[PDB]
Design a binder for this molecule. Structure first.
Ligand SMILES: O=C(Nc1ccc([N+](=O)[O-])cc1)N1CCS[C@@H](c2ccccc2)C1
Ligand SMILES: O=C(Nc1ccc([N+](=O)[O-])cc1)N1CCS[C@@H](c2ccccc2)C1
Lengths: 546, 546
């Protein structure tokens, strides 16, 4: 019974095969057929290429040796190489053109999801070229999805030598009959077959995957669109900044490029951005996913006033100061969306661009108390329930698993009524003791929220709702301003608390506002429709946020 | 008696004054004298500029109002404004030209060092221009050196209104007679003087500083070159990455731009880079200053083999993987310098560029055991003392303060002999019990090292020396390679362990190697000559590392 799948890199996990460029070059330059591929393999086990693949020499030292072999071959073939012939240019272009074979990666991802151990086994080189970063980025993107990456230049062994296959089996801790090995080189497949491994010669991806699903008994072809890559909390870089004596802010950090600060809502976590963090970093951004004040590993002081928008925003500015960031693009959802509009209004010099999921920008009404404004909307009744210190804390803290399972539900999963919460006497009074698991979350993801909230509970989080008057007075100071930095408003069709129509007048205060809209999407935007959130954010980031 | 110094921004801490550009523009465009400065102040307390400075409107909303005022003024003066007249262009250029007044900043730094509370009090605006980052960067660089930054647009008050001065005194927690207030605007100085503050009208910096030193009794002019900005450990962003089940790596992170990974030596800390971290971040880099494996907040497993170069390097690659960095420039000192050359040799695709302080690159001799090679050099005797587990640990751990005070000494401060350490029976056998404090360190800096080493002691650190044979065998695999990525070798004249002459053959293996050399500099390069280390590293980074 199979339990391990091994993939080659060139011609299997990445296409077009860097190998196939020698053939393409011969054709484009009208050189004798196989001349370049012959110079490439010259000397066989004792030649320059084997030394390169074993890690004896680097790619830059190999380049002149390949050029000498090309000349020796051309002399024998009684031909002339072009005037401007460059092995470096040929390989720079070939490596740059080589991209991940997405259906092959999806298959390896599915096999690993079904309990297989997966590995990449590759004949590769030590790349010291000026443009080596492109390949580094490729290898980084691919390697994260596999249990092991075995590189010939690192192990000092090369396919087809039998030792590399015994090394593979030893790292896999598996007998050969338990292993599928996929390669585009028939000669490199032979030693695996000779040991009794199931082997697949890869020409076109589709046939290789039909052979692979026939042999594993797992559907890999024509399968539904998979979810974006999520985060394993223990595999992340965890950052901590003290913003004032009793307050520290925690964040998860991934990637390089312009800083993108992700601000979650109520009652959430940095982990609410789990499907966005890997995608935004892959898109060329440095992601800083916060635990907002009152949450997870960030400090949660008890005082109500520690949670007014003026102080929360001041602390986020201090957070940038301490990290040495002059700006960040700010992306918020829910209460984090409210903070992000206030960051744009009060600190435009620190905000590269601003985006909000669900939360619209609505200016303070100076002729009405915020209580009156909240009371006018029947959907906002739950906010009055949140006012009295200790009441919502007791109910939300009574059974953590029940709390998250009841809150975190898709629009079709009997959401939770938000009207007559005060009349009813609580949020979960008409809710089951043991709610069913929403399709948006796994049991393990729920238990991450339970564990996070065990530290500080709901006092700090509920305090974000307890500064209505304080926030209203501060917001009134900004009534003559306009938001003129790049801005994105993303609406969610089925969010019945933060309804798309509530955002209809935003243009009056943000004239150049850009929009996104997600249909069949409830309040929990990020986990409800992760693929579409990612597409809308990356498109806006690359156009408007550098 | 004075105890607080307050500085204006424009014309005082930053020059040329953005104000003075209206005059310059009038002259360059042959417009009536004061026409632009008159349109700028139009309406006085009720005009567009006051609304801007109070934060009622942003800089982008103000721009058309200033243009209307310019036209109204020109109509009255019976003149025409040019065809291509643009307030935006004028202000973009003026703000971009405005730089920190370094001697004024040095004076504020000296006053704060002598116990003064310092503040910036400024009439400024909410900057939402596309080029707002330049000013954001300026404000960031300046604000870090002060106790308070009071901005008119944030407090909704403006100089010369008396309320802003009462607000200043309340934030300073000081009576007016205790405050020096420096401003380039005579009208903005009057309310401070009226309250009884010592005031200084700033025209030329030199006269202002003579007035300032006369009044405080502190030398601020013609003073020696100050040290670069250091780090306060509690003010930094602290990062943590798990690289494998029992191993986590700690780092301090500051700035934005290409990732620069700082690797300390023995027996050191991330804090050994304290004078480099702020300077490199200011220079446009993202600094990651490590606690190397075995040190500070990083894990310190007991096994010798956990500290061989192959594993240390593999873990540093995993560290980049987990942070989502395809590359970093690697800068090492001492044992960190050795690791960084090995990162370049084994993982060139992950190393943007490589620099070493003191540690040369010397290839492994395959015809001699590493023990023999170490025994050949009399200065390397202390390494034989470090071999036997527990022996050097007991001596180095006996009195932590004595350990660091004995080790950390400048070339002229009776360093410590490194020959006949085994014969002598220890490192400190001819050393005093209570060593004097080196001029390189303060008592507080010593106590930071003491506190860090209290966690794991010297077992993990000494284990870096205990893998001679293991490192020699691994290094021999790289004997046919050359280092062809950008490389910097920095030599220290008076390092008598890592002598400059030991680096003389490096070109044979690193043909394009660049060099730096520091005269009158001992082993502790970073703290011995911080200004020169900073100059050499920033120059090489901007030329060779993007
Ligand atoms: O209550 C909110 N969202 C929310 C989040 C979670 C739940 N929940 O039930 O889990 C309910 C509501 N909001 C956060 C974004 S704006 C905020 C708001 C503040 C002032 C006025 C109107 C609306 C309301
Ligand atoms: O011992 C070293 N430095 C050092 C650091 C601190 C002290 N000290 O006394 O504090 C003494 C020596 N070295 C680290 C850089 S290369 C290393 C080395 C390894 C192998 C062969 C020769 C030299 C020696």
């Amino acid at each position: 019974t199979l339990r391990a799948a091994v993939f080659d890199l060139d011609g299997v996990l990445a296409l077009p095969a860097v190998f196939g460029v020698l053939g393409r070059t011969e054709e484009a330059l009208a050189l004798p057929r196989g001349l370049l591929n012959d110079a490439f393999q010259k000397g066989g086990p004792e030649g320059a290429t084997t030394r390169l693949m074993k890690g004896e020499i680097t790619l830059s030292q190999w380049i002149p040796l390949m050029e000498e072999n090309c000349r020796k071959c051309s002399e024998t073939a009684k031909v002339c190489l072009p005037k401007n012939f460059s092995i470096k240019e040929i390989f720079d272009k070939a490596i740059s053109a080589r991209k991940i074979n997405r259906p092959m990666l999806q298959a390896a991802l599915m096999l690993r999801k079904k309990g297989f151990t997966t590995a990449i086994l590759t004949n590769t080189w030590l790349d010291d070229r000026a443009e080596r970063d492109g390949l580094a980025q490729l290898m980084c993107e691919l390697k994260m999805h596999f249990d092991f990456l075995i590189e010939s230049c690192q192990v000092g062994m090369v396919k087809p030598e039998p030792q590399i296959y015994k090394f593979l089996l030893d790292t896999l801790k598996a007998s050969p009959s338990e292993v599928v090995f996929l390669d585009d080189i028939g000669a490199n497949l032979k030693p695996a077959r000779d040991l009794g491994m199931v082997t697949i010669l890869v020409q076109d991806t589709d046939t290789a995957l039909k052979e692979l699903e026939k042999v594993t008994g797992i559907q890999l072809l024509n399968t539904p669109a998979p979810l974006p890559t999520s985060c394993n909390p223990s595999d992340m870089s965890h950052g901590y900044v003290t913003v004032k004596p009793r307050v520290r802010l925690h964040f998860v950090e991934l990637g390089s490029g312009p800083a993108v600060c992700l601000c979650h809502g109520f009652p959430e976590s940095w982990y609410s951005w789990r499907y966005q963090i890997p995608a935004l970093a892959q898109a060329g951004y440095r992601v800083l996913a916060m635990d907002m004040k009152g949450y997870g590993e960030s400090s949660a002081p008890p005082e109500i006033e520690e949670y007014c928008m003026e102080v929360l925003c001041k602390e986020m500015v201090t957070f940038l100061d301490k990290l040495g960031l002059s700006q960040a693009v700010f992306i918020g959802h829910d209460w984090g969306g409210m903070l992000v509009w206030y960051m744009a209004l009060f600190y435009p010099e620190r905000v590269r661009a601003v985006a909000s999921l669900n939360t619209p920008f609505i200016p303070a009404n100076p002729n009405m108390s915020p209580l009156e404004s909240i009371k006018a909307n029947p959907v906002f009744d739950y906010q009055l329930y949140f006012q009295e210190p200790g009441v919502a804390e007791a109910e939300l803290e009574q059974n953590l698993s029940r709390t998250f399972k009841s809150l975190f539900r898709a629009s079709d999963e009997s959401v939770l009524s938000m009207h007559k919460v005060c009349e009813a006497g609580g949020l979960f009074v008409n809710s089951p003791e043991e709610p069913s698991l929403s399709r948006m979350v796994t049991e393990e993801e729920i238990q991450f929220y339970v564990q996070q909230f065990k530290k500080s509970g709901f006092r700090g989080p509920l305090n974000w709702y307890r500064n209505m008057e304080r926030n209203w007075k501060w917001a009134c100071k900004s009534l003559g301003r306009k938001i003129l930095i790049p801005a994105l408003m993303v609406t969610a069709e089925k969010d019945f608390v933060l309804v798309p129509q509530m955002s209809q007048h935003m243009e009056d205060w943000i004239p150049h506002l850009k929009r996104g809209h997600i249909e069949d999407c409830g309040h929990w935007t990020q986990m409800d429709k992760p693929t579409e959130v990612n597409q809308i954010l990356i498109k806006w980031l690359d156009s408007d946020a550098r």
